[PDB]
Design an enzyme around this catalytic site. Sequence first.
Site, short mmCIF file in Angstrom:
data_model
loop_
_atom_site.label_atom_id
_atom_site.label_comp_id
_atom_site.label_asym_id
_atom_site.label_seq_id
_atom_site.Cartn_x
_atom_site.Cartn_y
_atom_site.Cartn_z
N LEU A 90 0.83 -1.20 0.00
CA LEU A 90 0.00 0.00 0.00
C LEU A 90 0.87 1.25 0.00
CD1 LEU A 90 0.95 0.84 2.64
CD2 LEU A 90 -1.23 0.18 3.69
N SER A 91 0.25 2.39 -0.30
CA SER A 91 0.94 3.68 -0.25
C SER A 91 -0.04 4.81 0.07
CB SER A 91 1.64 3.96 -1.56
OG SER A 91 2.62 2.99 -1.82
N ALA A 92 -0.42 4.94 1.34
CA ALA A 92 -1.59 5.74 1.68
C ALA A 92 -1.49 7.19 1.21
CB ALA A 92 -1.84 5.68 3.19
N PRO A 93 -0.33 7.83 1.24
CA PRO A 93 -0.26 9.26 0.93
C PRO A 93 -0.56 9.59 -0.52
CG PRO A 93 1.55 8.62 2.34
CD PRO A 93 0.90 7.34 1.88
N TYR B 78 -1.73 6.74 -3.31
CA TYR B 78 -3.08 6.22 -3.29
C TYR B 78 -4.10 7.34 -3.26
CZ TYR B 78 -1.97 1.27 -2.77
OH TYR B 78 -1.55 -0.02 -2.99
#
Lengths: 82, 723, 96, 87, 279
Positions: free
Chosen positions: E54-57, E60
């Site tokens: 994942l890559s929340a910042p 994404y």
Amino acid sequence: MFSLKKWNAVAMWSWDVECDTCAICRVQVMDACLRCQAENDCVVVWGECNHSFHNCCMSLWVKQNNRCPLCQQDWVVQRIGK
Amino acid sequence: EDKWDFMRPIVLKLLRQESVTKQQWFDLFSDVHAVCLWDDKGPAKIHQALKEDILEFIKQAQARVLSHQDDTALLKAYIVEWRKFFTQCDILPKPFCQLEEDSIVRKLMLDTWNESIFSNIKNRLQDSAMKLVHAERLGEAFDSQLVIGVRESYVNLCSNPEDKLQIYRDNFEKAYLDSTERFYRTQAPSYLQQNGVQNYMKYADAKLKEEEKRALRYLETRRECNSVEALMECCVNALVTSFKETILAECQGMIKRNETEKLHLMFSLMDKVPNGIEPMLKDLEEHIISAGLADMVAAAETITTDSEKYVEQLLTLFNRFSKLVKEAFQDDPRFLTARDKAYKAVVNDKCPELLANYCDMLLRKTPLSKKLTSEEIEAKLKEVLLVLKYVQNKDVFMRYHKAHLTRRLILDISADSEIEENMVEWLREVGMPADYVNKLARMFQDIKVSEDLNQAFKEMHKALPADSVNIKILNAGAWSRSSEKVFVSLPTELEDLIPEVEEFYKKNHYGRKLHWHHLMSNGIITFKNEVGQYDLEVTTFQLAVLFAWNQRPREKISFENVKLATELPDAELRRTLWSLVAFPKLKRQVLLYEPQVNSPKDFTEGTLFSVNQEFSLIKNAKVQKRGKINLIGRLQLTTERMREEENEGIVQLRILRTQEAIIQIMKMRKKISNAQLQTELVEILKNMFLPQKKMIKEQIEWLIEHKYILRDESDINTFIYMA
Amino acid sequence: DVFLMIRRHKTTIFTDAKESSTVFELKRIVEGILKRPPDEQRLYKDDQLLDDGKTLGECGFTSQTARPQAPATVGLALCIEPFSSPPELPDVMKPQ
Amino acid sequence: MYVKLISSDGHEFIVKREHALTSGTIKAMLSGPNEVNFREIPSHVLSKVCMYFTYKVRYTNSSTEIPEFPIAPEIALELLMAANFLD
Amino acid sequence: DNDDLIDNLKEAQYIRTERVEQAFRAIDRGDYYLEGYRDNAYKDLAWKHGNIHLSAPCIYSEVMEALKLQPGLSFLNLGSGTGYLSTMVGLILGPFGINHGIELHSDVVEYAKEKLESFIKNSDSFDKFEFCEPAFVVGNCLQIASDSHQYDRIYCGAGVQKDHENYMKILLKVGGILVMPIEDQLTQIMRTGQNTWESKNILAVSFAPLVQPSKNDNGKPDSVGLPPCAVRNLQDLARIYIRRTLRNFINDEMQQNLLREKIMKLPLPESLKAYLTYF
């Protein structure tokens, strides 16, 4: 007392077009073919194609000339010797 | 987090594989629901209370494993304790949900075992399990379920659901792969120098096969590595490959010495490895070439004409190594090929022409076909077939065989009509072209033609009366066996007979041109002498010789005088008289002579002959007063001379047939390399003359030196055909 | 298919029906899913008679009228216990 | 071939094993040592559980969209508790 | 820099809605990250660790905006990681939308379930909002079987090779949006007709590539396909209608969820995890 009681009239036959003329000799058709002499014995042997060949030349030259020089046909090899 | 006061009764009983009610386990699902619904810590304690209850069982299990001292009790106690525990690892961790298959409780069960107690228990399981096979490989009857159970345990002790190559792969797989290879590498010295290679291979094969059966027991067959295959690779390398150079080194010994018992395991093992079977094929090939020539260099050139002696010695050589293969390699098709390829370098030291003369002895009414029965005749023809399958010079077999088939049929001297027909399938089993296979059918049809032409004359023309004349008109090849077109003087009864037969066929059968041979025609003359009466059935040459004798049998006639009376050259009169003065297997000869001779060549122009006045048909060594004697003998056939005259042709064929194939190939292959030519030659020459390259190389080049085939200006190894 | 229940008294059996099938076929569709053959048993359509079987005109088994959220009722004189509402009070936090 | 789901009201819901075995715990139970008892779940809650089971299996092989499955506000609390015995 | 393009996409009024911001207010950053950090959702760095993709910042965030995500549409996620997008996109599409994720490894899907349970149990924003619980399967995202279907909004959560992009382009229905970090080039792929396509750039990104198929002479190739297209579980069904029930009431009563959920006639051991985030 030199009379005969029996004789087995043994001979061979060979193919040709007619027995009145000869394209391979200048002699009686029943003698050896002259093409092997005047046009240089005529040992004439039967093959599978039912056309005879000269077995004093094919025994050496069939590798290059697999034909019946004394007929009108190519030779289909059966016998290369005596 | 250790408070299953209501559920331990089910979990602990299941962990020990005690009888637990199906409903109780099922209700456990609603109890763990009750725990997460009616508690203070339910959602947090369920998975920790599992850990603590498992940990207590796990430590108890360690004591129940490690307290044992024997390898069997130690290994089995773990197997039993684990099997109970693992069985429940798919049952106890089904309930206990939503606490973070892949449940935490299942991970805790499997990891707690491995982390808590397997840290020390696994070294004793491997040591005992390894000692088991170390001793079992020596013949100790251990319980094989001990290493199976460890195998089952270690594949189940892996807790990773995605990559199960762990506890089993490291604490078991490798240890057995490395230890078994070292075991066999360090066991081999107990056999390497103590016994023969055959007996070593018996140990190498027996131990490898037994380990394979064990490999499918204690090496997970479905493992993501096929450990069993990896093991067999290291085991065969430890047992066979480490010995392969000596296993092969003694192949030359065992093969050369024809030790067919010691090649039993040699074949079983080496036929499995291309780098072992091929050396053996070359070892058999080379030994046949060396051993064959050691005998054939004399046999082929010193026997020359004796077909039974040569072929039996060739069958002795053939059977020496064919028995080797038929025994040592169960008649192997690759060692037969290596055998066949080897002989292509041997049997031409100049060719096995006597295989066809030997066949003629089997196919013609000869002592060989009289002393043998039908099964023995066919068996000997089958033995020749097995020989002919390898012979590099096959046209010399057909050269004689087809000349022999021709003469056997026209003379009606075949051993049997079925034997002549059997050669049609015989040659088809060999694989010869129809041009040669069906020669019997062609001769059969030609015999009918002769009979039809015979009757055509006899029933129309009636010189010697037709009742005494029997005409035989055969194909050109029946009699055209020599260039010596000699015709002999004859009495009127015969001299004026042929012209009529000739003229009949000239007009009645146009095209079919006759040619006569007085060496082949024959007849009967009646004689009386001083002891009785007899009739001579002899060739026309002999009839002319007899004509000289007929009116003067008691007058001595010189060889020169007969030559003048008969108009025969030395060659035909020497052969003609031989049949009358020295006929084989004849108690009384027809003609007598004064000099001592060894053969027909020794008759000189001054040699005197006379008729034997005591000659007649002999029965049981008693002299008869009347009978008919046939003294034609070999005059209508080909005598030993046949080899002397054909030997030149045999030499010619050694080059002719290859160059025939080359020229024919080049006609249809306009430009090809020598490698392509030799490739084509293998297919073309397979039924004529297919030697090893030690002869072909020169034969393909000779067509360049003598300006028959062209070659690429930039590539001397590429041939060009023109026109 | 269309949600279909085989119901009587206090037993509710969860089955289905095919939109294109006749009531006779549906007796075999229900038999297929339920393993209960039509032993003198006739299928209904929300209590619709559907004759005694082998009829189409009344067999309105359209999935839009018999979705998984809304089963068709088949009376196995019919008597089926209904599903009661929750006997719950607003209880402050859930006004009614 | 169905699993019988017993409600606390005494009502019996007959749901096919294919129809029920659409979630974890329901697969985890029974699959070892049908009938399932929900002594805490009334029939007006377990009906929606059983109808949801039939919904789940019938759309387990769906294409793109999945319909909504309405729940009455007075039963969702007990359906969640039922879910912790089935999901 | 690439900021001008991102601003052009916003200024073009492609997003318009606030649903994207609602997902960021509803879902707590970091509750989908590994327990050893629980921090990178708030920082721009390398977000790849273990099997977590994942890559929340920004990475994404632009994906969530790149997809218009009209409520009710079906979402397909190849490279779902721990479910960060699958949950937050499921929130944007509605708690009862369709959200079918696949990821390469079972360890991160196993962890994804731990994170969804951990979020419901111990997050801070759970008790305020409705949520969608996403579905997962494990398999190779590049091996698409003939049993795949069509989806409305599609995202790939891991690097895609341009030569294989069709493995998901074929899965987009007319009118949908497909977003993929193709060789770390994040693009917006739109289908405007049966054989008519349009695309725009989104962002230059950094993803771990998908594992390119290399299997032969067996039945691995093109035998994974998409997650089972199936109805979700009962806890999420009920849990959403529990949150709707309370949220719909307070919408009128306001004309605290943590305290209201304490009086439901349910035991605390259940409410503490199910509703109260353990207070």
